[PDB]
Amino acid sequence: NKAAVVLCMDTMSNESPFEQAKKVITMFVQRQVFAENKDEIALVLFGTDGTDNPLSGGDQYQNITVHRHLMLPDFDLLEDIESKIQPGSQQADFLDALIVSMDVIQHETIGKKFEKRHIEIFTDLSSRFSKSQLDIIIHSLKKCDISLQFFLPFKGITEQQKEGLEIVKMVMISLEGEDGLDEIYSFSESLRKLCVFKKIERHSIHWPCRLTIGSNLSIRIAAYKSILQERVKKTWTVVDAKTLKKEDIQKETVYCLNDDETEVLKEDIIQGFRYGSDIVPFSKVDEEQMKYKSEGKCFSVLGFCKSSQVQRRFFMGNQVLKVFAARDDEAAAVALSSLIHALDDLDMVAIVRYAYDKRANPQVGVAFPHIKHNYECLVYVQLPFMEDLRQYMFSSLKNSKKYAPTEAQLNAVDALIDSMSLAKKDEKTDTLEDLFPTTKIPNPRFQRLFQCLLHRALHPREPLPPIQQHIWNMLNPPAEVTTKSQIPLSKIKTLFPLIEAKKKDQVTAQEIF
Amino acid sequence: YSGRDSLIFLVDASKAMFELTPFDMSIQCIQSVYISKIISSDRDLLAVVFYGTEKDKNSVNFKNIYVLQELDNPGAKRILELDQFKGQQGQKRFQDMMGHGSDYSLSEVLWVCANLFSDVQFKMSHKRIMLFTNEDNPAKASRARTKAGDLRDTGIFLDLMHLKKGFDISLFYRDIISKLEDLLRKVRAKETRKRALSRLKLKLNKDIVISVGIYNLVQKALKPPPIKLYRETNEPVKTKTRTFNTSTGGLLLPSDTKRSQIYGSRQIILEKEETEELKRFDDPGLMLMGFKPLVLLKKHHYLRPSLFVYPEESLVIGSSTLFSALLIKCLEKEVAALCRYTPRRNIPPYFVALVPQEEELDDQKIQVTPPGFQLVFLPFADDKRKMPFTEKIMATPEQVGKMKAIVEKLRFTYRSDSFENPVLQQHFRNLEALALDLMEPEQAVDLTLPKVEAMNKRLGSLVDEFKELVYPPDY
DNA sequence: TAATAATAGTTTTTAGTTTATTAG
DNA sequence: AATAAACTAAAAACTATTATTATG
């Protein structure tokens, strides 16, 4: 999409609102540049010393400083935000900031398409304010549609802060309403957790095909990549040692004949295969006809069984598909809904022979529906081939006369289980709540990568980017369950022996430490 | 794992299986077994020895005993040697250079088999012998039975079915021994593995750990990697390949490799060392977080195939005891273990659910759901994907009832191993045909084409009757 | 002075390179 | 200008394998 965001900051440093505002704006801009979102942002500085306004409407706009117009951020912009912007001394007026912000927006709306509009104003409300131009500012707000994400230091605020709070909540309820009160947050805490960690999103595309239930009776369907082990968007670029570009960098082979220095070229190779004691020659041109021929992007379903026979253990593949119908095909949609309701009622799972396209591979798959009040479709997971069914005989454990847990150990384990429950127990309100929801936490590898990137970028001489402790906080459960299980841990360690281990991995070498 | 199963094929030549003739499908089954072995496992050994002929080709030079293939890894040349006698003209030429039925002694053939078994210079896990004859031939019988008993005591297994069909002719071999239809290439492109995954430590808390044996059970199969054989000599090249200096000329070095990502304004140039150290977060193992109910699962968040977890009483003793206790507790508890798991160094952690895997021994004591736990990957926030809203229309009770009647008419038991990959099967068949200088072997769909295309009339299709839209929904 | 130590090269996975359909 | 069949390095173990320091 596209977003239009304006920035405004609140002497001016009086903890200090200036430091929190600078921290949050630097964090926001670094998150934008790391996510590489396609949206430009504008920066306006009201209250900074000096009347350097872009447009001087009678010099009524005091201390208005448009540091940056609506432009795509970069590392240069982030360091400019870190360095150049310093607190002012004389109070400014909110009307000037709003008027200049929407003037910049209107100037920048000519030339660039925008799919979203936002406003990010930060003020301690200690600056003197006058409420005289409500009509024009509210008209501009409802025209430019800049969704105000305003933030406050925090109530026991001062009279100037009280008047600022009441005018801002009045203008929000006039414009937006309750959400206008909601979008106002504290400079710390709420805003601190709002943008401390980022996320990434790689959008997939529909799989417009036909569900072939039966010989004919096909049903138009569209499928999407639902759950996927995410990969990094950008791979590392191996650049030159000193040029730092791609001049002496290339991937190439020699294909020297195993001899005495004779070599071979690409046309000289044959794609043989190790047929046991020897290698039979073979070529891709031979593969062209000596290969299975698929039939387009078929969605052939072949079998139906009970949900009991299948196993969550036997869930294979590397992706998940929400099997939806096609676009606005009401007959197909209701037919699919009836079919999935029938399958759910009978617990009657389906077997699907899937192929992504003509060049794809046949894929046996299990089909069972998912039903919610917001989305209703079918879930598809790749079923195995009998080659995948690896078998390894294992000795029984419940009959281990040599290792039989004592009943004291059993009760200690019970106490441990009860203490380290990581989910809220379902009370009379059905409070089956995940105290440690893993699915809502992004992969820490990417946040660590971006932390290292900023560490090296903003300071090229900084050798080692440290691990974020907040990641450890995200990577560790609340200490309540740990403290509860501490005593059961003591019981277990007293009730369970062990012997020594090996493979003591060490650092590369023992330099000065 | 060291040691394999040794099977040797012994077939009588007594001009009684020459009359389809028992010799014919005996040779066919031997060829099919050899093909299945060469496509399945190469560490095994095969041997072909015949007796009763007019020639005495064997190490100790015993009468009527002919050896053709000794104990060795399966090879295409052995397949061609078998095939040259497969036909009826092959049968007669075989009888020519080998000799028709003649006098012999089962003691001698068992002695030759024992010598051949001793000839191998490897630890050989199991020793089995397959023998073929139409009727039992048998003095000679006493010594033969005594020698057979001695060999059975030495650790030799025997196998045989009379080639008349029923259960009529095994009289002279009732005690000698301790069905080939399934061996007629019914299994193809089998894969066999014996190793195990990397054993780790279960970091359940800050001080005590459990030596856990990791086991993959359903890992994805794939075709063997191709080799870059030469065009004429048909042998691979040394494949020398590494970046050197081209723009400036010369040779590049690993120390010269700088990595960067052009982001925004500038390219953040770094080296590899930062890249690997970025991937490092903790030590290998499973750092336990706690327990979470199995009911608290999204039921549709599979991303990587599950891996079995087993005790390994080799580094701590508490593995077996504590795992048995937990599995006993897994009866009462439906909560699942939450663990931060890293297979090895420099790996980002993944949250792991330990679904209780309790052993379910059947009448034959099949290790269904082996005793332990399976690793269940839990997706991150970024692993989730957005989904456009869709709450257009519901279904009607009439429609759901009609769909129920349509679907439950057709039900399947869903045998797990009932399907194999058509691509891999066709690839193996093509390699087999090329290795034997033949035509296209065959095409056999692994039920990929639904069988419902012909039995839809058999199940009484009714959705064709029930076209809910006047305009054909299936245009 | 007449043992067990670190020890190669196995396969086996596992993560990082390449050509078809959306955007103009 | 995205996803994915289809190659391409790379990192444990299950096997043989050798230097201890056994002693004048």
Numbering used by the authors:
A (entry chain C): 6 to 15, 19 to 22, 28 to 167, 195 to 299, 301 to 554
B (entry chain B): 32 to 50, 57 to 175, 181 to 207, 210 to 222, 238 to 534
Tell me, in the authors' exact words, what the paper reports.
In NHEJ, DSBs are first recognized by the Ku70/80 heterodimer, which subsequently recruits the DNA-dependent protein kinase catalytic subunit (DNA-PKcs), a large protein kinase belonging to the phosphoinositide-3-kinase-related kinase (PIKK) family. The final step in NHEJ involves DNA ligase IV (LigIV), which acts to ligate the two broken ends and forms a constitutive complex with XRCC4 known as LX4.
Although the construct for LX4 contains full-length LigIV, we do not observe density for the catalytic domain. The major interaction site between DNA-PK and LX4 involves the BRCT1 domain of LigIV and Ku70/80. The specific interaction sites are between loops of BRCT1 (residues 689–692 and 704–706) with Ku70 (residues 290–293 and 495–500). Sandwiched between these is an interaction between Ku80 residues 323–332 with a helix of the BRCT1 domain of LigIV (residues 706–715). Additionally, a clear interaction between the stalk of XLF (residues 170–182) and the von Willebrand A (vWA) domain of Ku70 (residues 214–222 and 185–196) is also observed. We demonstrate the fascinating ability of the NHEJ machinery to remodel in response to DSBs. It is striking that, from our structural data, XLF and LX4 make no direct interactions with DNA-PKcs; rather, the interactions with DNA-PK are via the Ku70/80 heterodimer.
